[PDB]
Structures are given as structure tokens and as C-alpha cells.
Amino acid sequence: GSSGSSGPFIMDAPRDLNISEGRMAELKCRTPPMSSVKWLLPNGTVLSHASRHPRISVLNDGTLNFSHVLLSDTGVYTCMVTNVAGNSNASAYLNVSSGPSSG
């Protein structure tokens, strides 16, 4: 993001999230109309609306849902945003702990 008040072309940017393994997670991310939204994985790859990934599903708004995060999914994700006006991207970390959140 650059100096100013408006900022990048991301109404909503993702932030470090903490979830357990085998649960539904989501990355807060909002993108404007007529824009290319995607997500890069810490494993060396990128997904997008087109992608037919079962777990990693990119919603319209531009949110990254996870049917069930795995201990191997733990890492850092980056959301790319390309628009005829400008280009911007954000990052975030996802923690996956094996087992539920109870005693």
C-alpha cells in the first residue's frame, strides 16, 4: 500500500488467522469489480476462481475458504489483485493445530 487515505485496490485485506486442523477457515479479502483475484500458496502455486480446487475455494468477493485446513497447509498465503487501474497484493499467515480446541 502507498501513502494516503484510499490505499491499495483492496477494500479488505487478509490477516494472520489461527484455526485447528480439520475445520472451516476463511481469509478476509475484498476485491473491486472487473479485477483478477487469486491466491498464492506457500508450496509454490496459485489458485483462482477458475481453479476447481475442493478445499481452496475462491469466493466471488475474493475470500479464500478452506473446507478443512491441514497441518501441511500451515504457512503464508498471498492474495494478488490486478486491475486496469492498478495492482496490489496482501499476505497472511495460517496456523493449523492438530486436534480440537477443547480439553
C-alpha cell recorded at residue 36: 483478477
* Residue 1 placed within a domain: no
Q: Are strands 17-20 and 87-97 parallel, antiparallel or unpaired?
A: parallel
How distant is the alpha carbon of residue 5 from its chain centre? 23
* Residue 20 placed within a domain: yes
Q: What is the DSSP string of 31-87?
A: --SSEEEEEEETTTEEEETT---SSEEE-SSS-EEESS--TTT-EEEEEEEEESS-E
* Residue 19 placed within a domain: yes
Domain range for 64 is 10-98
* Residue 103 placed within a domain: no
CA nearest neighbour of 49 among 71, 79, 74, 77: 79
* Residue 21 placed within a domain: yes
Place of cell 473446507: 67
Cα–Cα–Cα angle for 29, 31, 37, nearest 5°? Answer: 90
Q: What is the CATH number of the domain that holds 24?
A: 2.60.40.10
* Residue 5 placed within a domain: no
Question: Which backbone phi and psi does 88 adopt, to 5 degrees?
Answer: -150, 160
The total domain count for the chain is 1
Question: CA 95, CA 20: separation in Å to the nearest integer?
Answer: 8
Cα–Cα–Cα angle for 32, 95, 98, nearest 5°? Answer: 135
Distances (CA, A) of 20 to 11, 48, 99: 27, 24, 7
Distances (CA, A) of 37 to 9, 48, 72, 84, 87: 11, 7, 24, 13, 10
